[PDB]
């Protein structure tokens, strides 16, 4: 039936860029049906200072006063444990995001996941302040020599050893394997969460995107719009992701990884920018998956409950207690999301119709 | 500098699309070091009539008088055995290309490979006229059904059972698995030619493109200029294709599948036209692979000998007795290949350096 009450929705993986790109995307978080959003720091330059993350959050609140913003740091060589403690006590960050060097957009200044020992003092400081270590799990491509070949199709599976070693050396740290794309990564998350029927005892979780529940490799093969990192893998991998989405287990919640790019950055014959834009219809995208799986009863937990529980979002931080109501009204997705200016976006599943819509109903 | 006499080179897979594109790419066949070229019929509309294939060859000979052309028919429901016999008796065609519906460029008016029985009257007529059945070995992608899901990475391996049935039903018909990409296809070709000596005995062979000896999945991921059908697969597959190329076996000869597209057709955000342009440096591309393998003694067979032996190219049909001579002269690939008016093509490995160049020397 229609009009499902979702409460305070969560999108723990968001890119609202900057500039006129920010003026267009930040309001769409509200229009997409999301109240709490976790902002990613891969900007130019990456957000690695206290003044940058504070003024960046202020600019975001001016553009969307009703949206709760959870800020983050870019795991870079410039980060010090002193900066981690100072920013965490001032409530400026909720975690630090890690980018492997060169695997995705604005990841050039990232880290090498084969020598994580350099950032162990950083993770030690994060564990004390109860921050979250967001991981873009993918090994950089290696075609060189005798070592096993690492390519875009198995770079996620080759990273799982690094995830299990980080969970071993920092057991109390909250780690998130962002935007899982392979079945091998799903089984590892279930193995780490072996015997936790305790919703609050989940320390290593995994976010799932909207496009990775639809796309396979065939969808982005000749279509750069569906190209993102990690790449959309085989249908067997999509089968494991969709089952893990409607799973209802507390270690799986929603992170969109909505990466807006100008359409000129996607119509390239080489060097196409990675990332799918799904912010304008974030909740209706996930609504179609849970409807086709006949598991709409687990939609609130995946979108709202498990995200708030893991990040420990207390009610004193929510900028607007308005609730997101998902009512079954057909709407067609526009061919292009534009701002009446040089900026234009091709949204995910542009042209198709979604069975659900989203509106806002405040609490009384 | 070092020189290599290659004789009458062969490129048994060439796309020479109509229009101003034809007048631009057809001379590049001779400039690429290719003397004999097998022309593919995937035009718009495809080449299914006797009048259209006669006029097309005369257009090609008008643009490249010194290049020998071997024409082909497009496997379609419009074909009849009476048309097969008449065309083969006039030396109008040399074989028929099979395009599975919805697999590659201009495949739409194609066939369904898990139902090949409807074209057995055509194969029966081709078997009597000693024609060659060129196969695009890729089952159409099916992600649903109670059967194994088919995608761009296993569509070639899923076609192998169809190739084994055609070689069984028509044992004396010549069949070529065009542009092998997977290792499973390499092992399938070697096993069909188990008890095969004295190359004349080869009935089922395979062509290996120039770009598949360089590219993997990481090369076309985010680079539509390297996107082609079949998809460049994992490094394990690339290793087998290179081993099979320099092996010197008679059932592996060179077919480039040079698929020229305007740069405005590769720079799309949806529906990117597949195909790599490797015509302008066809032979120098292959020479780079054989130099890296120290198997230059087997180069003359892979590009000249095994192609003539399989297609039975008599000396009375060769349009020019000039020999393609490789000489070790370093050259840079241009950034674009343009006719100067409306068409600009991004060539394969544009910007890199090749250690060989091609010149033509008269015979005797
Ligand atoms: N464009 C992007 C793609 N993928 C990411 O993970 N982040 C981005 O910003
Ligand atoms: N563009 C093409 C790609 N692959 C083919 O086999 N033919 C084409 O024309
Ligand atoms: Zn990412
Ligand atoms: Zn992201
Ligand atoms: Zn093909
Ligand atoms: Zn072709």
UniProtKB/Swiss-Prot annotation, chains A, B:
GO cellular component: cytoplasm; nucleus
NAD keyword on record: no
SUPFAM superfamilies linked: Metallo-dependent hydrolases
BP GO annotations: 'de novo' pyrimidine nucleobase biosynthetic process; 'de novo' UMP biosynthetic process; pyrimidine nucleotide biosynthetic process
Induction: By N-carbamoyl-L-aspartate.
Cofactor(s) the record lists: Zn(2+)
Keywords, comma-separated and alphabetical: Hydrolase, Metal-binding, Pyrimidine biosynthesis, Zinc
InterPro entries, alphabetized: Amidohydro-rel, DHOdimr, Dihydroorotase_CS, Metal_Hydrolase
Pfam families found in the cross-reference section: Amidohydro_2 (PF04909)
Function: Catalyzes the conversion of ureidosuccinic acid (USA) to dihydroorotate, the third step of the de novo pyrimidine biosynthetic pathway.
PANTHER family referenced in this protein's UniProt entry, alphabetically: DIHYDROOROTASE (PTHR43137:SF1)
Extra remark beyond the main annotation: Present with 12700 molecules/cell in log phase SD medium.
The protein, known as: Dihydroorotase
Lineage: Eukaryota, Fungi, Dikarya, Ascomycota, Saccharomycotina
Chain's gene name: URA4
């Amino acid at each position: 039936v229609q009009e499902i009450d979702l409460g305070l929705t969560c999108d723990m993986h968001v890119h609202v860029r900057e500039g006129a790109m920010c003026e267009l995307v930040t309001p769409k978080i509200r229009d997409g049906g999301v109240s709490i959003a976790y902002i990613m720091p891969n900007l130019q330059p990456p957000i690695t200072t206290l003044d940058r993350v504070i003024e960046y959050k202020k600019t975001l609140q001016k553009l969307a006063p009703k949206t709760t913003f959870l800020m983050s740091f870019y795991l870079s060589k410039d980060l010090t444990p002193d900066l981690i403690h100072e920013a965490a006590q001032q409530h400026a960050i909720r975690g630090v995001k890690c980018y492997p060097a060169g695997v995705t957009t604005n990841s050039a200044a990232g880290v090498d996941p084969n020598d994580f020992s350099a950032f162990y003092p950083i993770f030690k400081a994060m564990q004390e302040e109860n921050l979250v270590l967001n991981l873009h799990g993918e090994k950089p491509s290696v075609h060189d020599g005798d070592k096993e070949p690492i390519h875009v199709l198995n770079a996620e599976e080759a990273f799982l050893p690094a995830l299990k070693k980080l969970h071993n050396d920092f057991p109390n740290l909250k780690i998130i394997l962002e935007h899982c794309t392979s079945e091998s990564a799903i089984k590892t998350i279930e193995d780490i969460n072996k015997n936790v029927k305790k919703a609050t005892d989940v320390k290593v979780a995994a976010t799932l995107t909207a496009h990775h529940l639809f796309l396979t490799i065939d969808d982005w093969a000749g279509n750069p719009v569906n190209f993102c990192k990690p790449v959309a893998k085989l249908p067997n991998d999509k089968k494991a992701l969709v089952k893990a989405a409607v799973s209802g287990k507390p270690y799986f919640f929603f992170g969109s990884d909505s990466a807006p790019h100008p359409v000129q950055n996607k119509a390239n014959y080489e060097g196409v920018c990675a990332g799918v834009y799904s912010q304008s219809f974030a909740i209706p995208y996930i609504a179609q998956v849970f409807e086709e799986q006949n598991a709409l009863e687990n939609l609130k937990g995946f979108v709202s409950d498990f995200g708030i529980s893991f990040y420990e979002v207390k009610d004193s931080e929510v900028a607007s207690s308005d609730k997101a109501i998902l009512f079954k009204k057909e709407q067609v997705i526009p061919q292009v999301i534009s701002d009446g200016k040089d900026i234009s976006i091709i949204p995910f599943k542009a042209g198709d119709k979604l069975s659900w819509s989203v509106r806002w109903e405040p609490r009384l």
